[PDB]
Amino acid sequence: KTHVQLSLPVLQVRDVLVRGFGDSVEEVLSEARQHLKDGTCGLVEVEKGVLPQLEQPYVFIKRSDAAPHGHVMVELVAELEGIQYGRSGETLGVLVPHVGEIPVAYRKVLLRK
């Protein structure tokens, strides 16, 4: 399938133990996709002061369309030193590894895989 229905645990930035996916744009997009497939991916909602608390490169989920079965269609865009790799809509949040942090909510998305 080109798209997969996921329910992503929404984490508070100060709970996150592993604050990024790796060290290159290509690695973080790779690792993000692997963690989404394995159900080991969390979502941090972006507000003032959140991104400086996480590690670059960043992996964002961005709205790809204007919502089958309650699931917003999203795609991955990475960012390193102010340059983005991909072009998409509004940010729903920044992806991070999930290693058992307690979420505050779940975000239903349809991920272009």
From Swiss-Prot:
Residues 2-113 form the CoV Nsp1 globular domain. It is found in: Host cytoplasm. Residues 1-113 are annotated as: Disordered. Signal peptide: none annotated. Inhibits host translation by associating with the open head conformation of the 40S subunit. The C-terminus binds to and obstructs ribosomal mRNA entry tunnel. Thereby inhibits antiviral response triggered by innate immunity or interferons. The nsp1-40S ribosome complex further induces an endonucleolytic cleavage near the 5'UTR of host mRNAs, targeting them for degradation. This inhibits the integrated stress response (ISR) in the infected cell by preventing EIF2S1/eIF2-alpha phosphorylation upstream of stress granule formation and depletes host G3BP1. This is Host translation inhibitor nsp1. It comes from Severe acute respiratory syndrome coronavirus 2 (2019-nCoV).
